[PDB]
Amino acid sequence: DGWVKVHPTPGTMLFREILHGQLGYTEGQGVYNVVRSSEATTRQLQAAIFHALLNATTYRDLEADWLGHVAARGLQPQRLVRRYRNAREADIAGVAERVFDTWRNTLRTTLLDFAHGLVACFAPGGPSGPSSFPKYIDWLTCLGLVPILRKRQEGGVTQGLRAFLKQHPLTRQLATVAEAAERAGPGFFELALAFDSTRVADYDRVYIYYNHRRGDWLVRDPISGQRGECLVLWPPLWTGDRLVFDSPVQRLFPEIVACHSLREHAHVCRLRNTASVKVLLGRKSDYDIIDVSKSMDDDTYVANSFQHPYIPSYAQDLERLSRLWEHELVRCFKILCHRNNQGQETSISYSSGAIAAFVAPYFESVLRAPRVGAPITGSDVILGEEELWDAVFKKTRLQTYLTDIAALFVADVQHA
Amino acid sequence: DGWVKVHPTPGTMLFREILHGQLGYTEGQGVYNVVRSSEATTRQLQAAIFHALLNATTYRDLEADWLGHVAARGLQPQRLVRRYRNAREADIAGVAERVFDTWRNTLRTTLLDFAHGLVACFAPGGPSGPSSFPKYIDWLTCLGLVPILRKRQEGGVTQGLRAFLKQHPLTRQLATVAEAAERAGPGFFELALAFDSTRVADYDRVYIYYNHRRGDWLVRDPISGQRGECLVLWPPLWTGDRLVFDSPVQRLFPEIVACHSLREHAHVCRLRNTASVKVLLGRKSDYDIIDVSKSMDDDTYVANSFQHPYIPSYAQDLERLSRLWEHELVRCFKILCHRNNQGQETSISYSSGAIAAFVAPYFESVLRAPRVGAPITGSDVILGEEELWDAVFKKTRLQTYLTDIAALFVADVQHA
């Protein structure tokens, strides 16, 4: 009653089998490997965790901890000045500055270690299993749809968070860490639940139905009978006894099939030329291959015979198709390429627009995660863990608090 | 009963034999040699060991040992100042600074020697035996699966640690090293047990079964009957009576098969042309090769005969396939190429993304190591042993402690 079949149709299977090179392969198609990588989402997770943890810091407890360290060394301004007993302000100021710098560096190292401890919990979940990103990307590449399944339940990631958090020594050892961690904890739990609940259907189990008369989707997993939900990102076009998607594979499809057919014909012609001598027989009027045509003739004579061993040439088409694949993917997925003075393709990366367009819908719709803050710039995908942590640290609240406390402490020591 | 046989089928054996050049070889495939090397894993392990050992250092015992050395020389500030009795503050400060610098250099060399001694215990097991990395990598390259077998037992690496550590003189000689080593000891024992426990199955002995309806794996070693556990990194696709993997060899498979068949045909055509002169006989009405067609003639006359000595050419196909192999391997494993002003391939290395993508899952799932800290940057693969130790030493706790001690000692000795 107005329903049609979309996904389990043979053409849909042929699209993915094209994605594995089941007819032809080219240098251009190899670029797709970069598009599927999970690097951007892991960078985004790291950035979000760093923001959440570092933003929770506070001034009062940090000042209390610094003053407590000074008390532990017993090096407050009065005692130090009374001990040194000289008017060389530069030396005393430098001593205080170096003490504070040592404390600053150790605090930074502690916070970095804890933040890395948090990150490890989520990283394995993202690329494989529930919410696997590469499956999402190849779903988009093949069809533009992305079936999804949802159930609320505690699972691996929540257990990992619970195991890691509840007994971490840093929480006991520092009040700053204790407060920041207890504040950011609930958000981490909700993000873990978000990673836990959702799954992206498998390309070889799910069923998808479409009813043109309304324009709504029914998606089901036959094995468990579990109804799902469909996310459409590039909507299709219905033209009667048809459904035409607008995915990159659909645009490229009519070309690669023609190229493959040309290659197969050229292969068939080559086998024909194996025999070097060919002989043609005829009927009387009343490494070698024989063409016996005498059985067709009757009251008929042979008048002419032509030979022309044609062999189609197809390298030009393969070159054209390789460059077509490369340009299509690069422009469709907003990839950015880096190059040397003349040397090409030093590296391949995700542009800022690419991450905004693809990673953002992933987190927001597919996972329904609570918050990710401001997205990272396209340049930060190239950085490492240390560089990203340093970048997040440098331009946020904790640095300003530390600098203010340092300036105040130096002024107080030299004024006391 | 819903089960399937996956690996021991002839297809996977054909893939593995493709790796050993059993049908053709090319310049591009030689790039694969870099992908198997164990440099990244060894560098990561060295960095992890250095972090574990060096991080345990504490300031209080540094102060204790420094004062112990000062007392051993008898060079206390008061005594030295009383010895010189002159107001050239710069000279005395320089003397004290040089003494402290000598102590720092000796301590650094001692710690480096101990750290190198500790690292050696693990290195031989990494490339061969349990947890062998190259077998992991070529498992991934062929299929995307990595069958793994486990059984907890103490073995070679734990015995090596126990033999190396328990009689080292540095423990007696220095309290700092003694406490740092004993504190880091349990982590090293855990890591060594992890090294000893796991094995990666051999490509020519294991069995792998797949059940599409469930979506779960069963792997078993037939010799010992020992059941295993299967890790999947790039999941395959089931098309009803066929399993299609998504490993690089699967994508490249049809192309190289076609090229090999072309080469075989070109070889066959070459032999045919060896005879320069050819003769063609016929039946009358009423270094040399002879074509006897007399038998088939019957009330028949010969009409025409054509010769066309064709010889297929395959050089362009080999060039294309070489470049295809090179690009596929470079882009799939995220390898990085260094180049001169115009010259190419000064050296080939592992990119940071490649390390994160391949080395990290190895340690996490395959080896289940406790902790490795933040992963090393791609540049640190190029560094040597000395350079890596120096780099990790520079930006960590011990350097800050030493610098603060130096500043305090200089100020106190000049002010005394």
PDB file of N, CA and C in Angstrom, chain A residues 16-17 20-22 25-27 30-31 33 36 39 73 83-84 86 88 91 98 102 116 204-205 263 270 273-274 276-284 287 290 294 307 309 314 345 348, chain B residues 59 89 212 237-239 244 246 251 254-255 262 265 272 280 285 291 296-301 303-308 310 317 324 327-328 331 353 373-374 404 407-408 411-412 414-415:
ATOM      1  N   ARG A  16      27.869  -0.760  -2.662  1.00  0.00           N
ATOM      2  CA  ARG A  16      28.919  -1.051  -1.694  1.00  0.00           C
ATOM      3  C   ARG A  16      29.976  -1.972  -2.284  1.00  0.00           C
ATOM      4  N   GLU A  17      29.566  -2.963  -3.076  1.00  0.00           N
ATOM      5  CA  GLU A  17      30.563  -3.820  -3.707  1.00  0.00           C
ATOM      6  C   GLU A  17      31.439  -3.033  -4.675  1.00  0.00           C
ATOM      7  N   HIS A  20      34.230  -1.592  -2.607  1.00  0.00           N
ATOM      8  CA  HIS A  20      35.332  -2.516  -2.351  1.00  0.00           C
ATOM      9  C   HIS A  20      36.116  -2.868  -3.607  1.00  0.00           C
ATOM     10  N   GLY A  21      35.849  -2.204  -4.725  1.00  0.00           N
ATOM     11  CA  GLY A  21      36.579  -2.490  -5.940  1.00  0.00           C
ATOM     12  C   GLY A  21      36.208  -3.790  -6.610  1.00  0.00           C
ATOM     13  N   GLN A  22      34.943  -4.204  -6.528  1.00  0.00           N
ATOM     14  CA  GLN A  22      34.513  -5.440  -7.171  1.00  0.00           C
ATOM     15  C   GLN A  22      34.435  -5.321  -8.685  1.00  0.00           C
ATOM     16  N   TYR A  25      39.708  -0.781 -10.033  1.00  0.00           N
ATOM     17  CA  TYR A  25      40.264  -0.006  -8.936  1.00  0.00           C
ATOM     18  C   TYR A  25      41.227   1.011  -9.526  1.00  0.00           C
ATOM     19  N   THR A  26      41.440   2.101  -8.795  1.00  0.00           N
ATOM     20  CA  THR A  26      42.203   3.219  -9.328  1.00  0.00           C
ATOM     21  C   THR A  26      42.900   3.954  -8.196  1.00  0.00           C
ATOM     22  N   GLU A  27      43.913   4.741  -8.564  1.00  0.00           N
ATOM     23  CA  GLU A  27      44.618   5.545  -7.573  1.00  0.00           C
ATOM     24  C   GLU A  27      43.687   6.543  -6.903  1.00  0.00           C
ATOM     25  N   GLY A  30      41.679   5.455  -3.899  1.00  0.00           N
ATOM     26  CA  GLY A  30      42.451   5.271  -2.682  1.00  0.00           C
ATOM     27  C   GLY A  30      42.342   6.442  -1.726  1.00  0.00           C
ATOM     28  N   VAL A  31      42.026   7.630  -2.245  1.00  0.00           N
ATOM     29  CA  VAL A  31      41.868   8.803  -1.389  1.00  0.00           C
ATOM     30  C   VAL A  31      40.755   8.580  -0.379  1.00  0.00           C
ATOM     31  N   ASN A  33      40.247   6.333   1.613  1.00  0.00           N
ATOM     32  CA  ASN A  33      40.706   5.794   2.887  1.00  0.00           C
ATOM     33  C   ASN A  33      40.882   6.890   3.924  1.00  0.00           C
ATOM     34  N   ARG A  36      37.504   8.100   5.600  1.00  0.00           N
ATOM     35  CA  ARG A  36      36.881   7.227   6.588  1.00  0.00           C
ATOM     36  C   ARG A  36      37.554   7.276   7.954  1.00  0.00           C
ATOM     37  N   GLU A  39      39.993  10.152  12.939  1.00  0.00           N
ATOM     38  CA  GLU A  39      40.873  11.072  13.655  1.00  0.00           C
ATOM     39  C   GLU A  39      40.111  12.285  14.182  1.00  0.00           C
ATOM     40  N   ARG A  73      56.417  24.472  52.572  1.00  0.00           N
ATOM     41  CA  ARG A  73      57.828  24.836  52.488  1.00  0.00           C
ATOM     42  C   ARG A  73      58.224  25.806  53.594  1.00  0.00           C
ATOM     43  N   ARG A  83      65.253  35.893  56.465  1.00  0.00           N
ATOM     44  CA  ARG A  83      66.401  35.009  56.306  1.00  0.00           C
ATOM     45  C   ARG A  83      67.460  35.632  55.406  1.00  0.00           C
ATOM     46  N   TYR A  84      67.044  36.203  54.271  1.00  0.00           N
ATOM     47  CA  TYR A  84      68.026  36.691  53.307  1.00  0.00           C
ATOM     48  C   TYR A  84      68.724  37.958  53.792  1.00  0.00           C
ATOM     49  N   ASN A  86      68.909  41.230  52.761  1.00  0.00           N
ATOM     50  CA  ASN A  86      69.647  42.049  51.810  1.00  0.00           C
ATOM     51  C   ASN A  86      68.664  42.768  50.897  1.00  0.00           C
ATOM     52  N   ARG A  88      68.849  43.225  47.609  1.00  0.00           N
ATOM     53  CA  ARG A  88      68.901  42.813  46.207  1.00  0.00           C
ATOM     54  C   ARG A  88      67.529  42.261  45.826  1.00  0.00           C
ATOM     55  N   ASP A  91      67.173  39.274  43.141  1.00  0.00           N
ATOM     56  CA  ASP A  91      67.419  37.891  43.539  1.00  0.00           C
ATOM     57  C   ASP A  91      66.213  37.300  44.262  1.00  0.00           C
ATOM     58  N   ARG A  98      60.776  31.535  40.580  1.00  0.00           N
ATOM     59  CA  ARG A  98      61.165  30.172  40.237  1.00  0.00           C
ATOM     60  C   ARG A  98      60.409  29.151  41.080  1.00  0.00           C
ATOM     61  N   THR A 102      58.015  26.307  39.432  1.00  0.00           N
ATOM     62  CA  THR A 102      58.082  24.875  39.702  1.00  0.00           C
ATOM     63  C   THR A 102      56.707  24.338  40.083  1.00  0.00           C
ATOM     64  N   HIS A 116      44.421  12.882  30.480  1.00  0.00           N
ATOM     65  CA  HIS A 116      44.683  11.720  29.638  1.00  0.00           C
ATOM     66  C   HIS A 116      44.022  10.476  30.214  1.00  0.00           C
ATOM     67  N   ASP A 204      24.270  -5.198   6.097  1.00  0.00           N
ATOM     68  CA  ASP A 204      23.842  -6.492   5.579  1.00  0.00           C
ATOM     69  C   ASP A 204      22.764  -7.142   6.440  1.00  0.00           C
ATOM     70  N   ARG A 205      22.097  -6.377   7.304  1.00  0.00           N
ATOM     71  CA  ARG A 205      21.003  -6.928   8.094  1.00  0.00           C
ATOM     72  C   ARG A 205      19.728  -6.102   7.965  1.00  0.00           C
ATOM     73  N   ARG A 263      36.675  -2.281 -20.641  1.00  0.00           N
ATOM     74  CA  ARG A 263      37.798  -3.145 -20.290  1.00  0.00           C
ATOM     75  C   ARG A 263      37.495  -4.602 -20.612  1.00  0.00           C
ATOM     76  N   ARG A 270      41.303  -9.367 -27.186  1.00  0.00           N
ATOM     77  CA  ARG A 270      42.686  -9.829 -27.133  1.00  0.00           C
ATOM     78  C   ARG A 270      42.777 -11.338 -27.327  1.00  0.00           C
ATOM     79  N   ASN A 273      42.880 -12.650 -30.976  1.00  0.00           N
ATOM     80  CA  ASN A 273      44.060 -12.486 -31.818  1.00  0.00           C
ATOM     81  C   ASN A 273      45.124 -13.546 -31.562  1.00  0.00           C
ATOM     82  N   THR A 274      44.845 -14.538 -30.714  1.00  0.00           N
ATOM     83  CA  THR A 274      45.882 -15.494 -30.331  1.00  0.00           C
ATOM     84  C   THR A 274      46.424 -16.259 -31.532  1.00  0.00           C
ATOM     85  N   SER A 276      47.697 -16.853 -35.136  1.00  0.00           N
ATOM     86  CA  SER A 276      48.358 -15.944 -36.063  1.00  0.00           C
ATOM     87  C   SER A 276      47.938 -16.144 -37.511  1.00  0.00           C
ATOM     88  N   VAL A 277      47.464 -17.329 -37.884  1.00  0.00           N
ATOM     89  CA  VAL A 277      47.045 -17.614 -39.250  1.00  0.00           C
ATOM     90  C   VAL A 277      45.605 -18.100 -39.221  1.00  0.00           C
ATOM     91  N   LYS A 278      44.780 -17.528 -40.090  1.00  0.00           N
ATOM     92  CA  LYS A 278      43.380 -17.902 -40.205  1.00  0.00           C
ATOM     93  C   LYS A 278      43.070 -18.216 -41.659  1.00  0.00           C
ATOM     94  N   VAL A 279      42.393 -19.338 -41.881  1.00  0.00           N
ATOM     95  CA  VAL A 279      42.093 -19.832 -43.218  1.00  0.00           C
ATOM     96  C   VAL A 279      40.583 -19.881 -43.388  1.00  0.00           C
ATOM     97  N   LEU A 280      40.110 -19.483 -44.565  1.00  0.00           N
ATOM     98  CA  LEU A 280      38.689 -19.435 -44.873  1.00  0.00           C
ATOM     99  C   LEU A 280      38.398 -20.399 -46.010  1.00  0.00           C
ATOM    100  N   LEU A 281      37.439 -21.294 -45.801  1.00  0.00           N
ATOM    101  CA  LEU A 281      37.082 -22.302 -46.788  1.00  0.00           C
ATOM    102  C   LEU A 281      35.820 -21.894 -47.537  1.00  0.00           C
ATOM    103  N   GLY A 282      35.620 -22.506 -48.694  1.00  0.00           N
ATOM    104  CA  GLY A 282      34.431 -22.259 -49.489  1.00  0.00           C
ATOM    105  C   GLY A 282      34.077 -23.488 -50.296  1.00  0.00           C
ATOM    106  N   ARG A 283      32.863 -23.487 -50.832  1.00  0.00           N
ATOM    107  CA  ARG A 283      32.323 -24.642 -51.535  1.00  0.00           C
ATOM    108  C   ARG A 283      32.647 -24.546 -53.018  1.00  0.00           C
ATOM    109  N   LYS A 284      32.955 -25.689 -53.630  1.00  0.00           N
ATOM    110  CA  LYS A 284      33.141 -25.739 -55.072  1.00  0.00           C
ATOM    111  C   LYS A 284      31.904 -25.206 -55.779  1.00  0.00           C
ATOM    112  N   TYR A 287      47.081 -21.934 -32.644  1.00  0.00           N
ATOM    113  CA  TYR A 287      47.974 -21.088 -33.430  1.00  0.00           C
ATOM    114  C   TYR A 287      47.506 -20.987 -34.883  1.00  0.00           C
ATOM    115  N   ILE A 290      40.409 -22.388 -38.297  1.00  0.00           N
ATOM    116  CA  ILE A 290      39.725 -22.639 -39.561  1.00  0.00           C
ATOM    117  C   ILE A 290      38.296 -22.128 -39.452  1.00  0.00           C
ATOM    118  N   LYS A 294      31.455 -23.354 -45.615  1.00  0.00           N
ATOM    119  CA  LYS A 294      30.931 -24.040 -46.790  1.00  0.00           C
ATOM    120  C   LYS A 294      29.506 -24.534 -46.595  1.00  0.00           C
ATOM    121  N   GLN A 307      39.799  -8.438 -43.563  1.00  0.00           N
ATOM    122  CA  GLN A 307      40.336  -8.699 -42.235  1.00  0.00           C
ATOM    123  C   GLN A 307      40.785  -7.390 -41.604  1.00  0.00           C
ATOM    124  N   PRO A 309      41.976  -6.653 -37.567  1.00  0.00           N
ATOM    125  CA  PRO A 309      42.058  -7.059 -36.153  1.00  0.00           C
ATOM    126  C   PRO A 309      42.062  -5.872 -35.194  1.00  0.00           C
ATOM    127  N   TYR A 314      42.228   1.417 -23.746  1.00  0.00           N
ATOM    128  CA  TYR A 314      41.438   1.880 -22.614  1.00  0.00           C
ATOM    129  C   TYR A 314      42.229   2.572 -21.511  1.00  0.00           C
ATOM    130  N   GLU A 345      51.065  16.290  -2.295  1.00  0.00           N
ATOM    131  CA  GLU A 345      50.474  15.424  -1.278  1.00  0.00           C
ATOM    132  C   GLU A 345      51.488  15.058  -0.196  1.00  0.00           C
ATOM    133  N   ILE A 348      47.241  14.706   3.948  1.00  0.00           N
ATOM    134  CA  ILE A 348      45.828  14.965   3.698  1.00  0.00           C
ATOM    135  C   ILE A 348      45.133  15.132   5.042  1.00  0.00           C
TER     136      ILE A 348
ATOM    137  N   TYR B  59      61.240  14.923  45.413  1.00  0.00           N
ATOM    138  CA  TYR B  59      62.153  16.025  45.707  1.00  0.00           C
ATOM    139  C   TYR B  59      62.903  15.815  47.019  1.00  0.00           C
ATOM    140  N   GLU B  89      81.974  37.694  44.551  1.00  0.00           N
ATOM    141  CA  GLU B  89      80.794  36.838  44.621  1.00  0.00           C
ATOM    142  C   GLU B  89      80.636  36.004  43.355  1.00  0.00           C
ATOM    143  N   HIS B 212      26.684 -15.684  10.177  1.00  0.00           N
ATOM    144  CA  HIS B 212      26.107 -14.389   9.835  1.00  0.00           C
ATOM    145  C   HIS B 212      24.907 -14.068  10.716  1.00  0.00           C
ATOM    146  N   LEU B 237      31.773  -7.853   5.041  1.00  0.00           N
ATOM    147  CA  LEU B 237      30.418  -7.767   4.509  1.00  0.00           C
ATOM    148  C   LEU B 237      29.985  -9.135   3.997  1.00  0.00           C
ATOM    149  N   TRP B 238      28.789  -9.566   4.383  1.00  0.00           N
ATOM    150  CA  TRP B 238      28.238 -10.844   3.948  1.00  0.00           C
ATOM    151  C   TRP B 238      27.147 -10.601   2.914  1.00  0.00           C
ATOM    152  N   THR B 239      27.296 -11.209   1.738  1.00  0.00           N
ATOM    153  CA  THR B 239      26.388 -10.983   0.619  1.00  0.00           C
ATOM    154  C   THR B 239      25.546 -12.220   0.309  1.00  0.00           C
ATOM    155  N   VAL B 244      33.091 -10.879   1.869  1.00  0.00           N
ATOM    156  CA  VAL B 244      33.999  -9.964   1.190  1.00  0.00           C
ATOM    157  C   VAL B 244      34.633  -9.078   2.248  1.00  0.00           C
ATOM    158  N   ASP B 246      37.462  -6.100   3.615  1.00  0.00           N
ATOM    159  CA  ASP B 246      37.828  -4.762   3.171  1.00  0.00           C
ATOM    160  C   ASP B 246      39.292  -4.453   3.472  1.00  0.00           C
ATOM    161  N   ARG B 251      40.961  -5.254  -2.099  1.00  0.00           N
ATOM    162  CA  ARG B 251      40.694  -4.222  -3.095  1.00  0.00           C
ATOM    163  C   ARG B 251      41.623  -4.364  -4.293  1.00  0.00           C
ATOM    164  N   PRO B 254      41.545  -8.078  -7.810  1.00  0.00           N
ATOM    165  CA  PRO B 254      41.192  -8.294  -9.226  1.00  0.00           C
ATOM    166  C   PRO B 254      42.191  -7.688 -10.197  1.00  0.00           C
ATOM    167  N   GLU B 255      42.717  -6.506  -9.877  1.00  0.00           N
ATOM    168  CA  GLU B 255      43.605  -5.807 -10.796  1.00  0.00           C
ATOM    169  C   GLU B 255      44.875  -6.609 -11.058  1.00  0.00           C
ATOM    170  N   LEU B 262      47.350 -11.229 -18.174  1.00  0.00           N
ATOM    171  CA  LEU B 262      47.870 -10.558 -19.361  1.00  0.00           C
ATOM    172  C   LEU B 262      49.326 -10.929 -19.608  1.00  0.00           C
ATOM    173  N   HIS B 265      49.550 -14.496 -21.004  1.00  0.00           N
ATOM    174  CA  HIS B 265      49.194 -14.547 -22.419  1.00  0.00           C
ATOM    175  C   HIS B 265      50.300 -13.960 -23.285  1.00  0.00           C
ATOM    176  N   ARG B 272      55.052 -18.490 -29.798  1.00  0.00           N
ATOM    177  CA  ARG B 272      54.438 -18.863 -31.068  1.00  0.00           C
ATOM    178  C   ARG B 272      55.200 -18.280 -32.252  1.00  0.00           C
ATOM    179  N   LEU B 280      51.314 -23.565 -45.475  1.00  0.00           N
ATOM    180  CA  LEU B 280      49.912 -23.951 -45.389  1.00  0.00           C
ATOM    181  C   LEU B 280      49.586 -24.848 -46.573  1.00  0.00           C
ATOM    182  N   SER B 285      41.911 -30.971 -55.810  1.00  0.00           N
ATOM    183  CA  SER B 285      40.624 -31.350 -56.374  1.00  0.00           C
ATOM    184  C   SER B 285      40.852 -32.464 -57.386  1.00  0.00           C
ATOM    185  N   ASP B 291      51.436 -26.338 -41.404  1.00  0.00           N
ATOM    186  CA  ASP B 291      50.025 -26.414 -41.033  1.00  0.00           C
ATOM    187  C   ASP B 291      49.345 -27.368 -42.007  1.00  0.00           C
ATOM    188  N   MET B 296      40.503 -31.932 -43.385  1.00  0.00           N
ATOM    189  CA  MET B 296      39.143 -31.421 -43.285  1.00  0.00           C
ATOM    190  C   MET B 296      38.537 -31.044 -44.628  1.00  0.00           C
ATOM    191  N   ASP B 297      39.350 -30.817 -45.652  1.00  0.00           N
ATOM    192  CA  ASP B 297      38.806 -30.482 -46.958  1.00  0.00           C
ATOM    193  C   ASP B 297      38.003 -31.655 -47.509  1.00  0.00           C
ATOM    194  N   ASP B 298      36.838 -31.350 -48.074  1.00  0.00           N
ATOM    195  CA  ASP B 298      35.999 -32.356 -48.722  1.00  0.00           C
ATOM    196  C   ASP B 298      35.090 -31.628 -49.702  1.00  0.00           C
ATOM    197  N   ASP B 299      35.363 -31.772 -50.998  1.00  0.00           N
ATOM    198  CA  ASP B 299      34.652 -31.016 -52.027  1.00  0.00           C
ATOM    199  C   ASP B 299      34.709 -29.524 -51.712  1.00  0.00           C
ATOM    200  N   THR B 300      35.882 -29.081 -51.270  1.00  0.00           N
ATOM    201  CA  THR B 300      36.079 -27.736 -50.758  1.00  0.00           C
ATOM    202  C   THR B 300      37.343 -27.139 -51.352  1.00  0.00           C
ATOM    203  N   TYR B 301      37.314 -25.831 -51.586  1.00  0.00           N
ATOM    204  CA  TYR B 301      38.464 -25.087 -52.070  1.00  0.00           C
ATOM    205  C   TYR B 301      38.797 -23.979 -51.084  1.00  0.00           C
ATOM    206  N   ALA B 303      39.806 -20.319 -49.931  1.00  0.00           N
ATOM    207  CA  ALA B 303      39.440 -18.997 -50.423  1.00  0.00           C
ATOM    208  C   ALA B 303      40.478 -17.931 -50.124  1.00  0.00           C
ATOM    209  N   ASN B 304      40.856 -17.751 -48.863  1.00  0.00           N
ATOM    210  CA  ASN B 304      41.837 -16.737 -48.506  1.00  0.00           C
ATOM    211  C   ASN B 304      42.533 -17.161 -47.222  1.00  0.00           C
ATOM    212  N   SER B 305      43.688 -16.548 -46.973  1.00  0.00           N
ATOM    213  CA  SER B 305      44.482 -16.840 -45.783  1.00  0.00           C
ATOM    214  C   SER B 305      45.150 -15.550 -45.333  1.00  0.00           C
ATOM    215  N   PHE B 306      45.078 -15.257 -44.040  1.00  0.00           N
ATOM    216  CA  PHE B 306      45.622 -14.028 -43.478  1.00  0.00           C
ATOM    217  C   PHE B 306      46.590 -14.365 -42.352  1.00  0.00           C
ATOM    218  N   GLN B 307      47.664 -13.589 -42.244  1.00  0.00           N
ATOM    219  CA  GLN B 307      48.617 -13.708 -41.148  1.00  0.00           C
ATOM    220  C   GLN B 307      48.737 -12.366 -40.439  1.00  0.00           C
ATOM    221  N   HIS B 308      48.698 -12.396 -39.106  1.00  0.00           N
ATOM    222  CA  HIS B 308      48.797 -11.189 -38.289  1.00  0.00           C
ATOM    223  C   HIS B 308      49.471 -11.546 -36.972  1.00  0.00           C
ATOM    224  N   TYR B 310      50.347 -10.972 -33.786  1.00  0.00           N
ATOM    225  CA  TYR B 310      50.109 -10.040 -32.692  1.00  0.00           C
ATOM    226  C   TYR B 310      50.915 -10.429 -31.457  1.00  0.00           C
ATOM    227  N   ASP B 317      50.726  -1.463 -18.035  1.00  0.00           N
ATOM    228  CA  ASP B 317      49.964  -2.061 -16.945  1.00  0.00           C
ATOM    229  C   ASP B 317      50.831  -2.262 -15.710  1.00  0.00           C
ATOM    230  N   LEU B 324      49.917   2.124  -8.263  1.00  0.00           N
ATOM    231  CA  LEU B 324      48.714   1.845  -7.492  1.00  0.00           C
ATOM    232  C   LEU B 324      49.050   1.214  -6.148  1.00  0.00           C
ATOM    233  N   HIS B 327      50.566   3.975  -3.826  1.00  0.00           N
ATOM    234  CA  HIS B 327      49.591   4.919  -3.287  1.00  0.00           C
ATOM    235  C   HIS B 327      48.658   4.250  -2.288  1.00  0.00           C
ATOM    236  N   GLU B 328      48.180   3.045  -2.604  1.00  0.00           N
ATOM    237  CA  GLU B 328      47.289   2.344  -1.688  1.00  0.00           C
ATOM    238  C   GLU B 328      47.951   2.137  -0.334  1.00  0.00           C
ATOM    239  N   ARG B 331      48.471   5.523   1.622  1.00  0.00           N
ATOM    240  CA  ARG B 331      47.281   6.187   2.151  1.00  0.00           C
ATOM    241  C   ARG B 331      46.531   5.325   3.159  1.00  0.00           C
ATOM    242  N   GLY B 353      49.421  10.109  13.176  1.00  0.00           N
ATOM    243  CA  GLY B 353      48.139   9.447  13.038  1.00  0.00           C
ATOM    244  C   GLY B 353      48.271   7.950  12.873  1.00  0.00           C
ATOM    245  N   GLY B 373      50.844   6.097  29.022  1.00  0.00           N
ATOM    246  CA  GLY B 373      50.860   7.546  29.002  1.00  0.00           C
ATOM    247  C   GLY B 373      50.435   8.080  27.639  1.00  0.00           C
ATOM    248  N   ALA B 374      50.734   9.358  27.434  1.00  0.00           N
ATOM    249  CA  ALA B 374      50.426   9.985  26.160  1.00  0.00           C
ATOM    250  C   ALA B 374      51.294   9.376  25.061  1.00  0.00           C
ATOM    251  N   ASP B 404      65.434  24.155  40.465  1.00  0.00           N
ATOM    252  CA  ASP B 404      65.097  24.852  41.701  1.00  0.00           C
ATOM    253  C   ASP B 404      66.188  24.657  42.747  1.00  0.00           C
ATOM    254  N   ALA B 407      69.152  26.914  41.823  1.00  0.00           N
ATOM    255  CA  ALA B 407      68.915  28.320  42.135  1.00  0.00           C
ATOM    256  C   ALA B 407      69.012  28.570  43.634  1.00  0.00           C
ATOM    257  N   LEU B 408      68.384  27.707  44.436  1.00  0.00           N
ATOM    258  CA  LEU B 408      68.435  27.881  45.882  1.00  0.00           C
ATOM    259  C   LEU B 408      69.865  27.794  46.392  1.00  0.00           C
ATOM    260  N   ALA B 411      71.861  31.003  45.436  1.00  0.00           N
ATOM    261  CA  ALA B 411      71.465  32.152  46.241  1.00  0.00           C
ATOM    262  C   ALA B 411      71.972  32.016  47.671  1.00  0.00           C
ATOM    263  N   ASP B 412      71.818  30.830  48.264  1.00  0.00           N
ATOM    264  CA  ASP B 412      72.221  30.643  49.651  1.00  0.00           C
ATOM    265  C   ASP B 412      73.733  30.740  49.813  1.00  0.00           C
ATOM    266  N   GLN B 414      75.917  32.375  47.919  1.00  0.00           N
ATOM    267  CA  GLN B 414      76.405  33.741  47.760  1.00  0.00           C
ATOM    268  C   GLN B 414      75.943  34.638  48.902  1.00  0.00           C
ATOM    269  N   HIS B 415      74.749  34.391  49.448  1.00  0.00           N
ATOM    270  CA  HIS B 415      74.243  35.228  50.532  1.00  0.00           C
ATOM    271  C   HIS B 415      74.884  34.881  51.870  1.00  0.00           C
TER     272      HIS B 415
END
